[PDB]
Design an enzyme around this catalytic site. Structure first.
Site, PDB file in Angstrom:
ATOM      1  N   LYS A 162       0.680  -1.330  -0.158  1.00 24.44           N
ATOM      2  CA  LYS A 162       0.095   0.327  -0.136  1.00 24.44           C
ATOM      3  C   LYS A 162       1.203   1.002   0.273  1.00 24.44           C
ATOM      4  CE  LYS A 162      -2.094  -1.511   3.580  1.00 24.44           C
ATOM      5  NZ  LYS A 162      -3.137  -1.366   4.130  1.00 24.44           N
ATOM      6  N   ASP A 198      -4.785  -6.146  10.926  1.00 20.55           N
ATOM      7  CA  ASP A 198      -6.515  -5.423  10.463  1.00 20.55           C
ATOM      8  C   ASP A 198      -7.820  -5.965  10.059  1.00 20.55           C
ATOM      9  OD1 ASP A 198      -6.334  -3.432   7.801  1.00 20.55           O
ATOM     10  OD2 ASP A 198      -5.971  -5.609   8.718  1.00 20.55           O
TER      11      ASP A 198
HETATM   12  N1  LIG Z   1     -16.115   7.336   0.760  1.00 15.97           N
HETATM   13  C1  LIG Z   1     -15.439   6.412  -0.093  1.00 15.97           C
HETATM   14  N2  LIG Z   1     -15.390   5.226  -1.183  1.00 15.97           N
HETATM   15  C2  LIG Z   1     -14.944   4.232  -1.644  1.00 15.97           C
HETATM   16  N3  LIG Z   1     -13.174   4.280  -1.270  1.00 15.97           N
HETATM   17  C3  LIG Z   1     -13.221   5.491  -0.416  1.00 15.97           C
HETATM   18  C4  LIG Z   1     -13.669   6.605   0.580  1.00 15.97           C
HETATM   19  N4  LIG Z   1     -12.933   7.628   1.042  1.00 15.97           N
HETATM   20  C5  LIG Z   1     -12.201   6.816   0.996  1.00 15.97           C
HETATM   21  N5  LIG Z   1     -12.224   6.197   0.160  1.00 15.97           N
HETATM   22  C6  LIG Z   1     -10.618   5.178   0.302  1.00 15.97           C
HETATM   23  O1  LIG Z   1     -10.334   4.086   0.660  1.00 15.97           O
HETATM   24  C7  LIG Z   1      -9.249   4.012   1.355  1.00 15.97           C
HETATM   25  C8  LIG Z   1      -9.465   4.113   2.494  1.00 15.97           C
HETATM   26  O2  LIG Z   1     -10.428   2.541   3.007  1.00 15.97           O
HETATM   27  P1  LIG Z   1     -10.215   2.855   4.703  1.00 15.97           P
HETATM   28  O3  LIG Z   1     -10.208   1.253   5.129  1.00 15.97           O
HETATM   29  O4  LIG Z   1     -10.841   4.088   5.202  1.00 15.97           O
HETATM   30  O5  LIG Z   1      -8.596   3.256   5.074  1.00 15.97           O
HETATM   31  P2  LIG Z   1      -7.628   1.690   5.890  1.00 15.97           P
HETATM   32  O6  LIG Z   1      -8.855   0.263   5.730  1.00 15.97           O
HETATM   33  O7  LIG Z   1      -6.628   1.342   6.426  1.00 15.97           O
HETATM   34  N6  LIG Z   1      -7.617   0.857   4.573  1.00 15.97           N
HETATM   35  P3  LIG Z   1      -6.767  -0.891   4.277  1.00 15.97           P
HETATM   36  O8  LIG Z   1      -5.502  -0.569   4.180  1.00 15.97           O
HETATM   37  O9  LIG Z   1      -6.859  -1.586   3.255  1.00 15.97           O
HETATM   38  O10 LIG Z   1      -6.963  -1.426   5.725  1.00 15.97           O
HETATM   39  C9  LIG Z   1      -8.891   5.409   0.653  1.00 15.97           C
HETATM   40  O11 LIG Z   1      -7.020   4.896  -0.387  1.00 15.97           O
HETATM   41  C10 LIG Z   1      -9.822   6.110  -0.282  1.00 15.97           C
HETATM   42  O12 LIG Z   1      -8.750   6.084  -1.340  1.00 15.97           O
HETATM   43  O1  LIG Z   2      -5.280  -3.423   5.227  1.00 14.49           O
HETATM   44  C1  LIG Z   2      -6.182  -4.165   4.353  1.00 14.49           C
HETATM   45  C2  LIG Z   2      -4.368  -5.350   4.080  1.00 14.49           C
HETATM   46  O2  LIG Z   2      -3.360  -4.753   3.059  1.00 14.49           O
HETATM   47  C3  LIG Z   2      -2.807  -5.537   2.278  1.00 14.49           C
HETATM   48  O3  LIG Z   2      -2.861  -5.783   1.770  1.00 14.49           O
HETATM   49  C4  LIG Z   2      -1.866  -5.918   3.580  1.00 14.49           C
HETATM   50  O4  LIG Z   2      -0.590  -5.989   2.760  1.00 14.49           O
HETATM   51  C5  LIG Z   2      -2.690  -6.747   4.396  1.00 14.49           C
HETATM   52  O5  LIG Z   2      -1.944  -6.712   5.628  1.00 14.49           O
HETATM   53  C6  LIG Z   2      -3.531  -5.920   4.788  1.00 14.49           C
HETATM   54  O6  LIG Z   2      -4.422  -6.527   5.296  1.00 14.49           O
HETATM   55 MG   LIG Z   3      -7.543  -1.093   7.928  1.00 13.63          MG
END
Ligand SMILES: Nc1ncnc2c1ncn2[C@@H]1O[C@H](COP(=O)(O)OP(=O)(O)NP(=O)(O)O)[C@@H](O)[C@H]1O
Ligand SMILES: OC[C@H]1O[C@H](O)[C@H](O)[C@@H](O)[C@@H]1O
Ligand SMILES: [Mg+2]
Ligand SMILES: Cn1ccnc1Sc1cc(C(=O)Nc2nccs2)c(N)cc1F
Ligand SMILES: [K+]
Length: 450
Positions: A162, A198
């Protein structure tokens, strides 16, 4: 010439048709994923497997947990989160204090030292805001990256995902990196008792309102899943009794060519301009870090074919990351009069007609529907695998889910559910969205660990 608008839309469709996946394309993806999962669980095949199936050392049912005050950390996005949770007997857990910190770009792509220095500073500030730098609180770390565990509290970073790049971190014990940075300050002193993914935190937090929850899924920036495996099938760990959580890391599916028949020009461009080219290819079809950007590239091809915006692209349309994934959600939220699509595109320095607006909607629908269907082949694999490892004819299973794409996109969720259900006969799948699931999941695991 309303005749010449619809002809523009008929050619747009010939191009958009490339994002379609038939039900048998999905079954094929599903089979191939199930095959990679097998290979990742086996000692003999683990090293070459693209789906790593990493043991988490979170074992099925626990014995008794301590109660009281815990500190959760969450690192994985473009923000880092700290929270204080109260755990109590009933098992139950509540968010008391919370605070989110934006990560300086120079700590994302600088050194590990810089990153964990910044993390420790945030922890110091948080504990001040709430006069807490004295009670030696047990610390749970939600760390959203592939780790190889030796234990619940010890594991090494395999590789960043990411867009994370901090140097001096891959190959090292992550908990050790955290502990060192804390000690560099004089902070201080937390008993770090547990590090979880997560997906794991989200499954653990959904378990207490639904004991049938044995799968955790994230569809946010990235895309990943975890599930309860039989200890007899986890060849990398000693023992055959009970169950253990497995972090699929299914985002890397396709890294050895397993998705090649399905990758499009747009996917190659997205892969090639990414922080990790050749890596996390399945995730790059689904995750929100990549979704808007994929839509942007479709609009550029539509502009280049003289089918959109008169054949001219604004300076904003031609800049990286400018079509935000949220705009994909917001375009598909439009109720028919085109006003939301209009303001998004207008703010992007474009002068769209009615038919431009509709075409942009079709592009968003094409990209997010593909994400939804690619994602469903993964979950169905996992769940079909679990039905087959167990004795009952109908499997009744709950899935815990978090992530802005699943949660905020107006129709991903419904497309995703219906597709999963077509691929999982003889399963009854309940989907639940987690509530502060990372932090609550981390503290709950910590309470059993310490
Ligand atoms: N309203 C929305 N609809 C769809 N996607 C969005 C929206 N707002 C933000 N995002 C995208 O979703 C991502 C953030 O997702 P979010 O699930 O809130 O964080 P996260 O869980 O830390 N992601 P991850 O690393 O996959 O666990 C960013 O890359 C944004 O581009
Ligand atoms: O945040 C959602 C996911 O993002 C990336 O795929 C990471 O490698 C994984 O560990 C995590 O669970
Ligand atoms: Mg997350
Ligand atoms: C998801 N599911 C289903 C029934 N068993 C589980 S797993 C599960 C595991 C733990 C847990 O903390 N397990 C640990 N094993 C070793 C240290 S902590 C928990 N605190 C709560 C859980 F629900
Ligand atoms: K085993």
């Amino acid at each position: 010439n309303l005749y010449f608008q619809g002809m523009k839309k008929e050619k747009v469709e010939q191009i958009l048709a490339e994002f379609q996946l038939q039900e048998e394309d999905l079954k094929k993806v599903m089979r191939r994923m199930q095959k990679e999962m097998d290979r990742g669980l086996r000692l003999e095949t683990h090293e070459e497997a693209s789906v790593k199936m990493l043991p988490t050392y979170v074992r099925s049912t626990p014995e008794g947990s301590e109660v009281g005050d815990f500190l959760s950390l969450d690192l994985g996005g473009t923000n880092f989160r700290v929270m204080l949770v109260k755990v109590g007997e009933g098992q139950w857990s509540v968010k008391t204090k919370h605070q989110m910190y934006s990560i300086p770009e120079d700590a994302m792509t600088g050194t590990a030292e810089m990153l964990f220095d910044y993390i420790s500073e945030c922890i110091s500030d948080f504990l001040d805001k709430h006069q807490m730098k004295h009670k030696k609180l047990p610390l749970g770390f939600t760390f959203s990256f592939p780790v190889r565990h030796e234990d619940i509290d010890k594991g090494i970073l395999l590789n960043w995902t990411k867009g994370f790049k901090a140097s001096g971190a891959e190959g090292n014990n992550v908990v050790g990196l955290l502990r060192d940075a804390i000690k560099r300050r004089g902070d201080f002193e937390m008993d770090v008792v547990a590090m979880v993914n997560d997906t794991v935190a989200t499954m653990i937090s959904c378990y207490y309102e639904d004991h049938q929850c044995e799968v955790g899924m994230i569809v946010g920036t990235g895309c990943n899943a975890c599930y309860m495996e039989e200890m007899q099938n986890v060849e990398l760990v000693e023992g055959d009794e009970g169950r253990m959580c497995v972090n699929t890391e299914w985002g890397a599916f396709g890294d050895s060519g397993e998705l090649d028949e399905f990758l499009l020009e747009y996917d190659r461009l997205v892969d090639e301009s990414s922080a990790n080219p050749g890596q996390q290819l399945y995730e790059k079809l689904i995750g929100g870090k990549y979704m808007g950007e994929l839509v942007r590239l479709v609009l550029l091809r539509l502009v280049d074919e003289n089918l959109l915006f008169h054949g001219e692209a604004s300076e904003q349309l031609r800049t990286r990351g400018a079509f935000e994934t949220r705009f994909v959600s917001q375009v598909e939220s439009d109720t028919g009069d085109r006003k939301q699509i209009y303001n998004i595109l207008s703010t992007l320095g474009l002068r769209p007609s009615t038919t431009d607006c509709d075409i942009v909607r079709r592009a968003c629908e094409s990209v997010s529907t593909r994400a939804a269907h690619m994602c469903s082949a993964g979950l169905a694999g996992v769940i079909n695998r679990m039905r087959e490892s167990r004795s009952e004819d109908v499997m009744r299973i709950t899935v815990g889910v978090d992530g802005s794409v699943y949660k905020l996109h107006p129709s991903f969720k419904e497309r995703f559910h219906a597709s999963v259900r077509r691929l999982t006969p003889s399963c009854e799948i309940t989907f639940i969205e987690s509530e502060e699931g990372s932090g609550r999941g981390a503290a709950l695991v910590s309470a059993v660990a310490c």
